[PDB]
């Protein structure tokens, strides 16, 4: 407050830190047939998506298997557990920095 910050900005900072701490609650599992990941429970997914207020279904499809703008064509490629994790901490570090 003394620095000249309204309370709403502090609330927004708290929202950002809450989002980054809640982002790691996502749990994935194998598809039992291929390397594709499986997402059975979206509780934390719904919480975090509403925390940034973006479309979860688009977010879910993108994060679980993104479409590559490779330039050749439009293609979505199956990912693995390590790829999804790497995306998770990449987003976390970018947000915090």
């Amino acid at each position: 407050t003394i620095m000249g910050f309204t309370e709403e900005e502090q609330t927004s900072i708290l929202r950002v830190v809450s989002s980054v701490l809640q982002l790691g609650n996502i749990v994935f599992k194998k598809e039992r047939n291929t390397d594709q990941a499986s997402m059975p429970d979206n509780t934390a997914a719904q919480k975090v998506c509403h925390l940034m207020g973006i479309n979860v279904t688009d977010f879910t499809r993108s994060i679980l298997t993104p479409r590559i703008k490779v330039g050749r064509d439009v293609v979505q490629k199956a990912q693995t557990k390590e790829q999804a994790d790497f995306a998770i901490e990449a987003l976390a570090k970018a947000k915090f920095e």
Binding site: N33, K69, G71, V74
Partner: protein, 96 residues
């Protein structure tokens, strides 16, 4: 060569800004299939293409729908369709 130049010219006529990634949808119109007394190789290739795409449609529909049916595999049993002509079209070329 004149036809090639004119089609490149109409391309450049439709060569507006080329943005990339948003969306698209394709439309195709193939040449027809005819049975006339005197034919060259090109019309044979066109008929082969028509048979190829008909086989593509049949295989796509039946085989793919049934393979998702197994992929979820909740409550399903194998059903008989047949109607495959891939060996017929394979006779075009295979030096093996």
């Amino acid at each position: 060569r004149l036809f090639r130049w004119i089609l490149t010219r109409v391309n450049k006529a439709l060569d507006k800004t080329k943005r990339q990634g948003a969306s698209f949808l394709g439309i195709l119109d193939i040449a027809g299939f005819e049975i006339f007394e005197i034919n060259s190789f090109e019309q044979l290739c066109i008929n082969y293409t028509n048979e190829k795409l008909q086989q593509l449609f049949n295989h796509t529909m039946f085989i793919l729908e049934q393979e998702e049916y197994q992929r979820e595999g909740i409550e399903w049993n194998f059903i008989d369709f047949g109607l495959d002509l891939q060996p017929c079209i394979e006779l075009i070329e295979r030096p093996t």
